[PDB]
Paper text:
Here we describe the de novo design of pH-responsive protein filaments built from subunits containing six or nine buried histidine residues that assemble into micrometre-scale, well-ordered fibres at neutral pH. We then applied the filament design method described in Shen et al. to dock these connected monomers into a wide variety of helical filament arrangements and design the amino acid residues at the newly formed interfaces to drive assembly.
Residue numbers in the entry:
A (entry chain R), B (entry chain O), C (entry chain Q), D (entry chain S), E (entry chain T), F (entry chain M), ...: 1 to 226
């Protein structure tokens, strides 16, 4: 597309980030304290603020992938970029099936709510998060490819990639740790461990959002450098 | 909606109740005594204070239904609550056609005013009242559902429901009695029976307002308990 | 459509009637007396208040036909109802061409205003009225069909149809009388006969509005009975 | 097509006429007076309001021909009607090439603007007008054929044809006069004669629009009589 | 097809399930209570909400079979899978003739409505339900084949099959019970038994929809595992 | 807002405090002694001077929260301040529903006045006080945040916070003690305990007003330090 | 657009200038003197009045470009004007990405505020200023093109262009000087140099506003001359 | 609009005239004598009482044009009236750009005040006056058209038009004389000629206000004659 289409898509992107950061802060805050004990309606909506947060992350990743396509179709594909973009499309398609699965098990929780089903639902949320991390690792690979293809040596871009790589490794380590503790919850299913597992989820979602922030930065520094 | 939207809608609700209670008392007072006999212009406006009262009750029920939707869309729907809310929307739509019919026959009384048309107009007012009672019985069913879904066991709520159920049965009995006497008026149409039928209407409107008062109470006790 | 769509369309209908009755009364009042003699600009706008009234009647008939379609598509078509609805659509299409013709001859009166063209314009208004009467006779046939199909035996509906039939025959007789006097105007074209023919038009428009009032009543009694 | 399709196409037709009459009046008004002398940009847009007017006439004629096809395909073709419709299609195709030629020479005037090229452009506008007159003479022949085929003897139609024939002869005489003066401009090319030739164009466009008005009238009187 | 085609088809599938569950709930709700007795138009539309529900189930099964074909054409056919897919195509073709038969007998009920024809129509609905159960038993066989072919041993899939088999046996037992009671209705045709047979239909449709839910689940767990 | 808007809002605040301190002193004085025994009209207005005092406290808290928003929207939000301000808005919204509930139970006391309903009304006043204490604990948290964010180290501010914290802990202890004695009144309902419970209410209101005095001080010392 | 649309857009333009001149004067005044040393909250909002000023300049340039499009679409495009307008659209799109980048780095300063990040933020403000200067140089080129195309020889316009060109060269020289000193700050990062670099920014913003003033003047003199 | 809207707009008109006549008299009086010599602040506000007077004339003309539109939209447009009203709208739009230009050059006089800029500002005031005269000549043409269209032959109206025409020619002659002397000032710029040119401006403003008086009279005589 032309410059105005990319600029409109980047305004949609930065407004989506400004919405996702507020929702992240409020989800940590409602994760912080509550003395009182939950209702039956608090089973029917067990984790609704997390599934609603993940949906915003998935919508942010879809826009990032649409901007990457609009950029590359401007600067011109090469073999390796086209292979990486096709991988990115296959991963974005996988994310739709993973979302429709989480959105099914969440509604099936309206009908067999029980302390065991709550652990199944939490494991479904961990598997959705583990697939969002893959989508981000592919988008970051496509971006490093586009930056090398343009021979784009500005120090702002260099430093923004040096930050993006470290944020990607931080997100890998956090995902492996979340799956490790989720196995321990699978061994020892309890309300006591469920309460402290919900925090581990919210603290992994925080790292996802702190990675999408850098992906949007590198996208801006590229569109300004071209 | 957020807490401020429900709080604003409940301020609109309680101010509407404080207006409707004054109008109820004044409508009984102007029902109590008048020696002098009516004019021709007192045919053209035969019952205007009753139709003006019913319009306020219909406007109060619309606000109650908007608060119920804002609450349930916060605490989260379930199959039976969502079915009951859809019933409540269908009944609130029925109430609009019943109001527009009463507001047509009232204006048709400007053009064929006669001692027979006055009995038709009174029967239209009784059928409007009989449809407002249905709208209240659906709102009370939705409220008892929401209270059970929240597992809301406070004694203030328990006692407020124990009052709401008895007021609903009192209103059913009063509606059946008003239609029963309205059949006797349909048999024996006279000014003598018209005068004593108007009181039966005003004494049924009093029970409607004494029911909306308890519906607004239970709505407050719920919003304070969440 | 669902109950809320029909209820919104009936609120649009009754508000359109309350606008059309006021415009009818004011058009009779401005038909009643004026001593002073008209200008040249009173040729360029010879009957503008009548053509503006007819446009409101045509817009009211369009809404009535949209409600009839929304009702029948809820309760279910049968062979004879579907044939009658297709007739109603063909007549509502004819009414659009008749309106665009009256709205052309009215503007052609801005450019050859003369005492002869005024008689052409009055005959165009009579032919528009004669086509609105047909549209009402088809809508009334569709309504009597729907009432028989629902086996809807309430006395309120029976009496409202007994009124609708008499108003339809009154409107047939008034249309034949208006066309009869319009032939006499065609023989004896004069300002003197133009003045007394304008009243005959306004007294036929009054019967059209007194028929739409009953069509809207029967529509309400049906939607309340289902 | 069915009655509703013709009625929609006639609403498009009459709205197109109401737009074309306003554009005609404003084009005469901007033809009336201007003291000040034109710029170089007033060469680059030498006659833009005429070419923009002709485009509206061509779009009105396309809709008239689409209504004629929808009518005849309803009432049934005959040998002479089908021959005349095929002639009308060949002339409407010729009009597209004549328009694309005027729309080419107008843009070639952006690149060799000179006092000689302005006279070429004016002659191209006269040749476009001379081809629109042919399209109108074929549409008027098709209409007189359809009216005779229906044996449609109403006096409104008879008088509307008696007007259409005279307007067609008036348009023939005006086209021959415009071509005659255009030859005199071709002999004596000057700004002085260009100014008075532009008026002759605007006064021929006025007769075209005053002919399409009658073609649309006869189309309405036909669709109302069938 | 590619990953994006299956992902689009699974979004269509899960949205179709979310529409079919709402229609199931509303069909039970309109099965729950109604005091008043039906009209003649309530013969002309005797079971319309059931035939409209079955049409949605048939449209959901068509999409499930299209996803199964898109999956198997990706992972690769084998003899037994290709035989089972050809069986599935033959059953999906049979379902089209069974639907067109129900859609014929329903319209023949517009023309000989009688208490005997209502029992014929109910038996046609039972035979349609009995053929949808077969289509589900073939789709479930194809799915168990595909799962074994992929050697797909995840516990989420294992448990989802352990649920699918039990739901298939529950649906067989419910179909045999519905046919058994349909024989008793065939012996004792009455409005009294018709009312309680309609409930047996709605309670069998509920089990069909509770089976399609599990077929769509297993389809998601497969597409995520491949 | 600009300096003049904050200065006007602080003049409104200090004038509201000067009204609330006088009303507190007079409410203690009318709590001190009265020999004579109350009327029936002294049931209909059982505690009116307390509910009228609480309404003034609620209006002072509303102004404090509007000044806090005007200050922070000048000096610039940060994550933790914006979260705390949103908590403050949710609590100020909760206070409106708690007020409308107290203002309902007070008017319901006009209609079933009895020695039992008086204990219900006193418990409603205690629950309103328990919600005002929460609103103050949120405002005091927001103020300590703003003071740390400005790095505002003046000794006047430090000492004013050292007073505000101690007053907040004094108010927590007084609220827990008031609820404890209110439970004992709920066990032992008597005029004898009602008389000594009214004093406990007035002595808790005194601590609320002695806390708003310090909140208004810290607000002034902040607006003067920036 | 018509004359009223351009006149409305020029009223929006001149009101935007009257807001931007006041903000320029006040930003110099708050740049002039302050003895006291900044807080931690004075890091979180380090330059907020500059970024808020730049946003107003960007909004003024958007309106100027909308007026240029409305003017040229009235007087008629030519090759060079249409190329220059497409350049102006591409530069206005670039300005949106540059703004969203400045609005990101400013918010990232809420989370890693440090003496090094403040120098990054100051360099981001210098790069935003360097892109606004480009947008102004393109708008001034479009205006000189439109003035030559209209052959607009008035002495007010001639002198207004002679001022616009000199102001554009003054703004080029000031931008090169600001980038030169920004390199020296990049070498020698200190609070001491940050304080004197902030003045260089405010003294470049003053020249931008003193250029937008002349662009709006030439736009008025053009719209009055056509 | 209805009679009350026109009557309110004519009350606004006559109150605006009563304010403008007082301001005219006082502006002549402060133009009459002052011995003492002006300050530097008497450069920064060189002609402020004239520009403030012109703003009142422009606001009076806006109301006159709004009343003309409300009148004609009541009595009904014709081709020539509609063309003249569209001209009046284009001229009223031109007057806004001419005002915003005068209001820019007046403020630019705060920043380069010098004996040469004062002559520029006086020439800007003369060009604004020359555009108000055009707006008045269009309003007077529209009024003479409306009077002929109503065939309004009263002698009060005839004589009021006979006055309006002479006042319009007097205002044309005065404008040509003011521009003639303004050319002589442009040749011979001096304080001596500036002092005597300011009087020529004030003596032209007097004729504008003495023309608006007659336009408001004719507007009243028309609204009273219909």
């Amino acid at each position: 597309g032309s410059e105005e289409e990319i600029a409109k898509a980047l305004e949609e992107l930065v407004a989506s980030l400004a919405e996702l950061k507020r929702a992240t802060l409020k989800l940590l805050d409602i994760t912080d304290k509550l003395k009182k004990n939950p209702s039956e309606s608090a089973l029917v909506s067990h984790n609704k603020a997390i599934v609603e947060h993940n949906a915003i992350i998935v919508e942010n990743n879809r826009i990032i992938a649409a901007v990457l396509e609009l950029i590359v179709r401007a600067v011109g594909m090469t073999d390796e970029i086209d292979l990486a973009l096709l991988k990115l499309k296959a991963s974005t398609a996988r994310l739709k099936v993973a979302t429709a699965l989480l959105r099914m098990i969440t509604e099936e929780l309206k009908k067999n709510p029980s302390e065991d089903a709550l652990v199944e639902h939490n494991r479904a949320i961990v598997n959705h998060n583990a697939i969002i991390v893959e989508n981000n690792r592919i988008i970051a690979a496509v971006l490093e490819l586009i930056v090398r293809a343009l021979n784009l040596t500005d120090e702002e871009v260099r430093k923004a990639l040096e930050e993006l790589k470290a944020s990607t490794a931080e997100l890998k380590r956090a995902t492996a740790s979340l799956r490790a503790i989720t196995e321990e919850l699978k061994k020892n299913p309890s309300e006591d461990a469920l309460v402290e597992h919900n925090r581990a989820i919210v603290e992994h979602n925080a790292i996802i959002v702190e990675n999408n922030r850098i992906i949007a930065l590198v996208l801006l520094l590229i569109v300004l450098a071209i």
